[PDB]
Each structure stands twice: as structure tokens, then as C-alpha cells.
Amino acid sequence: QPEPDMITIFIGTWNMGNAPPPKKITSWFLSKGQGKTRDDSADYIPHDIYVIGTQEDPLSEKEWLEILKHSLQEITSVTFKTVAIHTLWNIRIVVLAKPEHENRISHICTDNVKTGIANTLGNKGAVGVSFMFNGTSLGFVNSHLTSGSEKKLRRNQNYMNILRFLALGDKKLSPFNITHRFTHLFWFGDLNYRVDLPTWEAETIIQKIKQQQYADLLSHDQLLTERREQKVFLHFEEEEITFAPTYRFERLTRDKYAYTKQKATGMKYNLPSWCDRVLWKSYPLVHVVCQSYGSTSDIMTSDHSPVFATFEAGVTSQFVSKNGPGTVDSQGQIEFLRCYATLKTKSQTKFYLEFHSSCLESFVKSQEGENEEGSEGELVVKFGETLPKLKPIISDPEYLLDQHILISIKSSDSDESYGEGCIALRLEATETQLPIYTPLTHHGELTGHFQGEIKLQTSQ
């Protein structure tokens, strides 16, 4: 049986509104309803991995697992295996996989983050799962962020707290947060960003939705506008939204949006919004293609509709050579030429780099760079041709060209990372100097840039 070079991944997010689900939820897993939907001819074809995020979930883990497994068995006639389940309050993530993948999946991690302080601590936060699928690391985050149209800044803060503090993936990647630890990272949930239009415009918004005219509404979606202004989810992608707002519905129908202020809402309006979202971030030049992104129309127990998204995701095999693992492959090397970091910091410490990659036996520390002043105020840290030659464990180009180098620039004085980024080894040529570039972030915000040239030697 050959190892796959592609898998498909289902992501679901549903705020269940503290109500049990209806007896049939198969449309969710089939990607059927509104938006970018899945072809009927694929209904019996199982996804490799199903990742289900719920919010306001009233069920026990056992109760929900039985519903999910019985749902997938009905669709596909396959009995899925439970990879992981993790719950914080009423926020839950379930990962299921086809039984043939059980020996391909390892290094399973779970964690949660509670957001807020005192008043704001007790129900919002995130759960997450990570694991390796053969040579590929996969991370999944289900977050329920702060509610209310006038709290977008709080949601942005909740995002930064979650990506700083959620402890998933390889703990050896100490300078790196979850936004750099995985080949593919999926972040989904009731992110709670709203359509920012005047309250008086509620009925106009409803009209637009009935006409399936979403453009003037999406142009006021807080998640899209905050992303465009680089306030949140920097370097994440989202598929185009072509489904109606998924919040806030009257229960037991989808004919009516319930937007008016009520004691039960704390006297807040809930204008129709795309609260329920799926975003992703994959390492550079890895295959990832969204093949569905939509909402169900027939699951009406909650004031939200379920959202689905599916993806093709490139994966690599667990490579063994006669040499690595457990030695280098002298036929392989990675050289950096003419490299410099441009940093937004006002500090005047010396900086060094760390290179981290699962193609190395361990991470590599550089010498200190040479600081200069950029023309527009900036710190430029020059490394020249001083950077250590990296010795990969395997030189075979079918392995090495699929790898990535994580880079951290660290203060000599504090050993704290000032910026993190990632370079693909999927080059146009080997034994050839080629430009490389990554933005650098810290706590998920832009802190600078790293650029230069690479020269990659493989056994071919």
C-alpha cells in the first residue's frame, strides 16, 4: 500500500447554542447547503481526517462522539477512529481519522487557552489538537472569541493570547508559536466578528441576504477589515464567503434572523454576521487547496448554522535512508549568502539566528550579526557569508526539496526571539544561488523581514 502525497481534511465549526443537535447532521459532513459546496458524486468518498469544533456544546464527549461516528458511518460505511478529543467548558474539538491512518498518526497533543481576566475569564478561549501525519505536522485550533459588535479589539487580543499560549506541536521549537509549528494550521470557531453597519440598517441587511447580495455586507465584516489592516490573523488565508451570515437565527427555521436587542442579549443588537469561520496557514509552497466552504441549511437547533470547509493538503512520507535518521548525509548542505534581517525594534542589542528544521539533527545557532542603521530609521542586522553551513540528515532531493527552515532572530542580551519566519527548500534549482525571503513575526505581529540567498546541495 503506497503512502499518500495528498489527504483531504474536513473542518467543521458549529456554535450549538447549548441545544442538542437534530437527529440528522449528515449535510454538515457532506459540505451541502449554501456557499462553495461539495459535488454529489463525492458523497461516499471519506475525507482522511475530520476535525469538528463546537462552541456552546451541551453534550458529553461520549454523547457527541457517538453522534459523530454514527454520522460518518452512515455517509461512508467507514468506522472512524478517534485521534483526539479535548473540551474547555463548552468549547470542544474532536479529530477523527480513517482506520488505515492509525499507524500514520503520532505525537498527538491537546491544549486549551482561557482568555480574559476575572469578569471576562470563565467561558471564552480555545482548544487545539496537533499531530504528525507521516512526515507532515498538522495543527487545529477551535476558538470561541469575545462576543458583541463593539468588541473587535478584544477579539484581536483573544487571538494573540491563544497563539502565544496554546502549547501544541514540537516543544523543541521553543522560539516558535503555533503559527510556525505546523506544515498546515487550521484555525476555526465562533470568532464572533460582526457586520459593522448601523443598527437602523438591520432590515436593509436582511433584504440584501434574501437577494443573496453579500458584497456590501462582506465589505463591513470586521474579520475581513481587521485582517486587511493587519490587526489580526496575519499570514492566514480564508476562502471567499458565498453563503449567508450564519448568525443570529431564530431556532427551528432558517427563515428569520433574530437581531433586535433583548434582555437575553444584554440589550445588544445581533445584526446578521459571519461569526463562524475557517482560516488556515500552511508553510510556503506546500499544496493546500480549499475545496468547500459553506454553511448548512437544514440544521436548525442553534441560533448559528454549522460551517464546513474542506481542503486538499500535501503530505510527505516518513523518510528513511541508509544514512539519516541517526547520522548526516554528507552529500547534502544548505548555505545562506548575503543574508540580513531588517527589524522594527528600537533596541540596540546584538542578534544571532537559530535555524530549526526536522531535516536537521538539532537546531543550529549562528554567530552574531553586524548591526547597521537603515536609511528610514530601521535596524539592519547583516550576517554576510558568516552563517553556518546546515547539514541535513538526508540528501535525497525528493526529501530535501519538501523541507522548510524555521528562523528565529534572538537578542544576545536576553536570548528572546524578536522575530520568527520560515523558508521553503522547494527551490527552482539546486547548486544555484537563489533569493529567499520571509517576513518575521513575534506574537503573530510583524516585527521585520529576513532576506538573502540560499544554495542547496542534494545528492542529485
How many chain residues interact with ligand AXG (CB under 6 A)?
Answer: 4
Q: Which x/- pattern over 121-160 shows residues binding ligand AXG (rule: CB under 6 A)?
A: ----------------------------------------
| Smallest separation, CB 218 to ligand AXG (Å) | 10
Q: How far apart are CA 46 and CA 30, in angstroms?
A: 9
| Smallest separation, CB 278 to ligand AXG (Å) | 15
For ligand AXG, give the closer residue by CB, 110 or 222: 222
Sheet containing 91-97: order of strands: 34-36, 288-295, 307-314, 6-15, 49-55, 91-97, 81-88
| Smallest separation, CB 274 to ligand AXG (Å) | 13
**Binding status of residue 228 toward ligand AXG by CB under 6 A:** yes
The answer to whether the CB of 321 falls within 8 A of the CB of 329 is yes
**Binding status of residue 227 toward ligand AXG by CB under 6 A:** yes
For ligand AXG, give the closer residue by CB, 224 or 241: 224
For residue 39, what are the contacts with CB-CB under 8 A and spacing of at least 6? none
Member of 224, 271, 339, 393 binding ligand AXG (CB under 6 A): 224
For ligand AXG, give the closer residue by CB, 242 or 457: 242
**CA dist list (Å): 147 to 53, 165, 196, 236, 282:** 17, 21, 13, 21, 28
Cell of 309: 470547509
| Smallest separation, CB 177 to ligand AXG (Å) | 17
For ligand AXG, give the closer residue by CB, 125 or 421: 421
Contact segment (CB under 6 A) with ligand AXG among 45-53, 69-77, 220-228, 385-393 equals 220-228
Which residue in 1, 182, 175, 51 sits closest to 107, CA to CA? 182
Q: Which x/- pattern over 174-213 shows residues binding ligand AXG (rule: CB under 6 A)?
A: ----------------------------------------
**Buried b / exposed e along 214-242 (16+ C-beta atoms within 10 A):** beebbebbbbbbbbeeebbbebbebbebe
| Smallest separation, CB 315 to ligand AXG (Å) | 23
For ligand AXG, give the closer residue by CB, 249 or 280: 280
For ligand AXG, give the closer residue by CB, 128 or 421: 421
| Smallest separation, CB 433 to ligand AXG (Å) | 24
Q: How far apart are CA 159 and CA 279, in angstroms?
A: 13
Which residue in 283, 294, 292, 289 sits closest to 312, CA to CA? 289
| Smallest separation, CB 439 to ligand AXG (Å) | 7
Contact segment (CB under 6 A) with ligand AXG among 13-21, 123-131, 195-203, 223-231 equals 223-231
Q: Which x/- pattern over 57-76 shows residues binding ligand AXG (rule: CB under 6 A)?
A: --------------------
Cell of 105: 498518526
- For the four alpha carbons of 148, 34, 312 and 11, in that order, the dihedral sign comes to positive
Count of C-beta atoms within a 10 Å radius of residue 374? 11
The answer to whether the CB of 14 falls within 8 A of the CB of 28 is yes
**Binding status of residue 322 toward ligand AXG by CB under 6 A:** no
| Smallest separation, CB 230 to ligand AXG (Å) | 8
Cell of 74: 452512515
| Smallest separation, CB 238 to ligand AXG (Å) | 8
For ligand AXG, give the closer residue by CB, 132 or 440: 440
Q: How far apart are CA 294 and CA 287, in angstroms?
A: 21
For ligand AXG, give the closer residue by CB, 239 or 329: 239
Q: Which x/- pattern over 236-275 shows residues binding ligand AXG (rule: CB under 6 A)?
A: ----------------------------------------
For ligand AXG, give the closer residue by CB, 219 or 367: 219
Q: How far apart are CA 26 and CA 71, in angstroms?
A: 6
Q: How far apart are CA 401 and CA 404, in angstroms?
A: 8
Count of C-beta atoms within a 10 Å radius of residue 191? 25
| Smallest separation, CB 451 to ligand AXG (Å) | 14
For ligand AXG, give the closer residue by CB, 225 or 430: 225
User: Hey, is 311 helix, strand or coil?
Assistant: strand
Residue 150 forms beta bridges with which residues? Answer: none
For ligand AXG, give the closer residue by CB, 227 or 254: 227
Count of C-beta atoms within a 10 Å radius of residue 140? 30
Contact positions vs ligand AXG (CB under 6 A)? 224, 227-228, 235
